[PDB]
């Protein structure tokens with residue numbers, strides 16, 4: 001129970017969740033497949049942003065470079081004492097009966113948390129259409145490992161198809177948890193115990209929406225603890 005909350009995905013929703021939880025002293029483990037992609041935008045994030053959010057703090061009105069936004073956001077997360085940001089590729093759910101206690105990782109070492117949050121964005125069943133090529137990636141140059149979706153599918157989880165687009169321009173078709181799997185008020189993926197989901201992998205929205213959702217989840221978990 002080292003981590004009170006284990007979050008899979010250091011993107012706009014997952015990192016925001018980690019941010020507010022850490023501000024309150026919650027022991028958070030933020031697991032993400034690529035540290036070089038932490039909080040990486042598609043198009044440059046532009047105001048307005050949720051007040052006091054990690055998203056707002058990471059913004060620089062004089063620097064629109066998306067990679068720089070990623071770097072500034074990553075650095076901000078690394079400054080939170082109760083937060084441990086680490087690299088690992090989640091490949092499946094660690095279960096004890098009907099309870100999710102963590103995730104298996106491709107590299108081998110399992111990661112555990114009292115509560116497990118999936119904030120994997122557009123990386124489930126991702127297909128990136130760029131010109132005359134189709135890549136298995138949730139965002140430009142960011143590969144998507146098929147394992148997690150396969151595990152969730154094997155366990156019985158239902159998904160719906162969604163699509164996002166970047167004005168080279170490209171489109172990303174991905175899978176989001178079917179609405180019936182998710183309890184909006186608690187962020188619970190009710191099919192199993194101790195499992196939560198937030199962000200694009202459960203509901204559409206832009207950067208600010210992802211951030212607001214992450215904060216809302218953090219506030220809910222703080223109440224539950």
Ligand SMILES: Cc1cc2nc3c(=O)[nH]c(=O)nc-3n(C[C@H](O)[C@H](O)[C@H](O)COP(=O)(O)OP(=O)(O)OC[C@H]3O[C@@H](n4cnc5c(N)ncnc54)[C@H](O)[C@@H]3O)c2cc1C
Nearest residue numbers: 009011012013033042043090121123164165199200206207
């Ligand atoms: C093609 C496309 C373009 C978009 N463009 C914009 C835009 O220009 N402006 C805007 O406001 N919104 C845009 N959106 C909507 C939304 O704001 C973004 O998708 C945003 O990144 C969603 O936040 P998220 O936290 O759900 O996912 P992300 O920010 O994508 O973060 C997901 C994280 O999870 C990690 N991850 C995934 N699977 C695993 C795994 N198995 N193990 C470990 N880590 C994993 C990823 O590597 C990543 O770091 C776009 C959406 C799409 C699909």
